[PDB]
Design a protein around this nucleic acid. Structure first.
Ligand SMILES: [Zn+2]
Lengths: 83, 97, 83, 101, 93, 95, 102, 97, 78
DNA sequence: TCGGATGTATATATCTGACACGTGCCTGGAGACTAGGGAGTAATCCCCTTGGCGGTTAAAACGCGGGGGACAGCGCGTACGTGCGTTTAAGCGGTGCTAGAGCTGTCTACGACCAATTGAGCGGCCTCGGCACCGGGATTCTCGA
DNA sequence: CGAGAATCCCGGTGCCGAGGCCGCTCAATTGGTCGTAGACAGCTCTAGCACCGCTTAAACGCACGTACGCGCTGTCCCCCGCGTTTTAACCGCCAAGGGGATTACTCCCTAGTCTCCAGGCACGTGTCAGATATATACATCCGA
């Protein structure tokens, strides 16, 4: 759960996005803190603008491999955050 | 009765249209198309008839040049008929995208 | 009034006259769609530029000056409509 | 003579080209013989184009030059065709040409 | 309002060369556009040369090099000859 | 010895911010300098042309915004105008 | 400085000097240097990121003209933008026609 | 043993597309440039950097032209390039009249 | 002189371009097109140098000439 | 190879509007002055370009053999040109309307110019490691089988 | 399926270009004033949109049948790969002086300003060159 919650808003990671600096953030919060505001990593300040451009072009922002694991382990938490 | 063989009427037509200068694509359909294309980008634009005429001028010139190059490519291929591969080669060698 | 399928107003006899002026002799059946596509993209670019010029002018009317000046931007200058 | 055009024996206005250059931000300052030079070059160019336009008009048995005559002139003159290789003339038309095959 | 144009000037040249030929409005406008086209071309080239050569004013040498770079060989040669004749006339009288 | 100016230190700053563990050759800095100069020239020239055209003698943020929209292709131009508007509002916030 | 005033990395003073010295207009506004510095900075950041990515893929720790060429000609809209620029020591992309293959 | 024709060709193709150094030797090219400049004005001096820049530009332009000729040749169903291909490519580009 | 551009060099250029098989006349044709291109570029550059009042053709002038011809080159302080 | 018919070119009239000219008026053009910076010119220094000469060495040139590629002939089948009958909508031309381009007054916030002050940035000096180069092994392919 | 080189993957040395630090002067900062380009309001008339109807020229669909695109075959000869001989490009090194760069000096060319006025502007009006319709005369192209 602690590893499965993003460190910014502390809620469970829903639609997590793993930046190339290996960091991960939850989605409504990814685009609230990064996509439209800074285009940089909240912790290591790595610029990510072209990364987001390419992924939004190819719709691959949400790590499927980790997302499936999270849904299998904490489906109730995922549903509670979604609601 | 009579039927011209294929080709002679084609030469007659090309000489007819190379002698004259009037516009060929019909003006009301062209205006409708350009108004639609404009409506795609921003809403509520009005157009000068002179602007529509200028757009028609440029489109005519561009398409005639393209067809000239396509004919050159088709002749190079030892053919008489032009095809979309000829069109694509013309655009590629021109360097358009 | 909503406009739709106006690209079909470019009739195949008109396409034929364009090719006859261009010097073509024998015409295939599949080239009408290709000519429509190329005309579409060309109009898209020129209309984009003209609309942006008018937008910067803070007007609601697209003018012959704007169209000519867009064509000059594209390096396809046109004479006879002012400037 | 008072006017610079009459001073240099030219038809194009030295004062007009002087004003245009001053209101063009081409340089902080402009010289004196520069408008005269530019007007002479412009006049020669117009004379050059009118040569061929008039000759084509005489060929077509007309008294007035028109865009078709201008287009024929430009595309028959080799050098001016290289100068205006990327110019479209309204109502110009295309030279009569059929390729061999 | 006023719409400046070179109409009377082109008419003067045409009357000088072909006394028996008149001009239409479309052709007149075409010629007016052509003059402005060459005007901006030459002026921009001269400005670039002046800025590059670290000089604060353009002059006859600048426009001479501009015409030489722009027009093709024989046209440029006759144009530069015309220009030097005209400037010599102006500076002499 | 002429005191020619260059963009090398700031290019190096941007590289340090984006890719921390990477270096640059002097040749590469040359191309980066030329590229920056070329983009600057194109934007300034078209904006001056626009300002001359609308019969207005001042070049402003609106002129440069239209400049970016005409010159750069769609996606990048959207990103650039976003970045620029962020920068200008941040600047005008402080004095 | 004005650069720190907006968080940019490019010289507001230098670009303001260049706009005046180029005689582009009679007068120049205040937001113009900030806007132009921001756009230049973002463009250089894009180019550097792609070049560095290509270089790291090639397994080297510095950017060279070949890495710059790979980055520019590998991306679609950047190729469109620099479609008329030849890069010194850039080489050409590996591309062979299908029919030409054995 | 002998490789069949074309395999060494494509091996060289790969090797040369992987490389980045210049192909034309410096001394003949410099003598060519000096001879060309001799016709126009007498006793000019050249920077080595200027000669290198000219070499760069000529290299790139020739490579691009050969790409276009290969495209035309493969369009013609041939596999060997020919002078007519280069002529047509130049014409379509618009360099040659 | 013009034949200094030798046929293995022409072959290497073609190989870099992606060409597989070459004919005999390609060499002379390539010599012609290269001669034309060089003529134009050095004409423009020499005009620039003549204007500048200098007897040394500098790479900056060549970069300006290439910019005029629409063949911009990066890497020489442009 | 003559002959019909259909397209083209030719001739003629005629009525119309586009071009040419007269004319009168106001903004741009011409003349005169100034003072101030920018280009012209002399001189000096030193840097970079030219020239010469040779040494090993890889590249260019030449010959040869053959096999794969270009080019010409042939035959088949279909897709497009041509003619006709029917359908559709573009073109011409009055009418009506109002939304927006264009012109003008007023006032004002914003940017050019000038003087004082300082620190970012450029030329230089330094130092050290990333990759050029190279000798040893694996592979990833090409060609004969 | 076999060998068998070309190329890919690998450990070692070492050296020249990258990264860091130094310090000073010219460009950035700051403060201030004055004037004009620019923002905002108000009124007004060309023109762009919408409509309707009548007419007729042009677009559709069909049929037919013949010229051309396409695959196949064969043949002849023109590049490709390899081995051997000749050559000059490449590097290092030394000499030399022509001309690029910088600084100083000074006179003269031009922006800015004010005063006069006429060539260029719009507006009104007259008439002849040319589009259109229509009547006529030949070139020629294909069926017979
Ligand atoms: Zn991070």
């Amino acid at each position: 759960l602690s590893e499965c919650q993003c460190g910014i808003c502390m809620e469970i990671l829903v639609e997590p996005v793993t930046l190339p600096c290996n960091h991960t953030l939850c989605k409504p919060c990814f685009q609230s803190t990064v996509e439209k505001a800074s285009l940089c990593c909240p912790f290591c300040r790595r610029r990510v603008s072209s990364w987001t451009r390419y992924h939004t072009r190819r719709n691959s922002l949400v790590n499927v491999e980790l997302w499936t694991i999270i849904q299998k382990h904490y489906p109730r938490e995922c549903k509670l955050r979604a609601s | 009765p009579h039927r011209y063989r294929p080709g002679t009427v084609a030469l007659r037509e090309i000489r007819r249209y190379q002698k004259s200068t009037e516009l060929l694509i019909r003006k009301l359909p062209f205006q409708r198309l350009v108004r639609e294309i404009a409506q795609d980008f921003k809403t509520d634009l009005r157009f000068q008839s002179s602007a529509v005429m200028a757009l028609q001028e440029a489109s005519e010139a561009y398409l005639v040049a393209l067809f000239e190059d396509t004919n050159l490519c088709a002749i190079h291929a030892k053919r008489v008929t032009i095809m979309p591969k000829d069109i694509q080669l013309a655009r590629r060698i021109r360097g358009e995208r | 009034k909503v406009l739709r399928d106006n690209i079909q107003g470019i009739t195949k006899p008109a396409i034929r006259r364009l090719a006859r002026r261009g010097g073509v002799k024998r015409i295939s059946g599949l080239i009408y769609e290709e000519t429509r596509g190329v005309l579409k993209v060309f109009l898209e670019n020129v209309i984009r530029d003209a609309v942006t010029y008018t937008e910067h002018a803070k007007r609601k009317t697209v003018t012959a000056m704007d169209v000519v000046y867009a064509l000059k931007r594209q390096g396809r200058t046109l004479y006879g409509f002012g400037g | 003579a008072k006017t610079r055009s009459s001073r240099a024996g030219l038809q194009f206005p030295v004062g007009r080209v002087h004003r245009l250059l001053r209101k063009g931000n081409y340089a902080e300052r402009v010289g004196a013989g520069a408008p005269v030079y530019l007007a002479a070059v412009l006049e020669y160019l117009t004379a050059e184009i009118l040569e061929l336009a008039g000759n084509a008009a005489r060929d077509n048995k007309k008294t007035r030059i028109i865009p078709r005559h201008l287009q024929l002139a430009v595309r028959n003159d080799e050098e001016l065709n290289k100068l205006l290789g990327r110019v479209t003339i309204a109502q110009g038309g295309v030279l009569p040409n059929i390729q061999s095959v | 309002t006023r719409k400046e144009s070179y109409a009377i000037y082109v008419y003067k040249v045409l009357k000088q060369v072909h006394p028996d030929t008149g001009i239409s409005s479309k052709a007149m406008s075409i010629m007016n556009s052509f003059v402005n086209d060459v005007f901006e071309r030459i002026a921009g080239e001269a400005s670039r040369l002046a800025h590059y050569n670290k000089r604060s004013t353009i002059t006859s040498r600048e426009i001479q090099t501009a015409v030489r770079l722009l027009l093709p060989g024989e046209l440029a040669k006759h144009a530069v000859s015309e220009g030097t004749k005209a400037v010599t006339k102006y500076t002499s009288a």
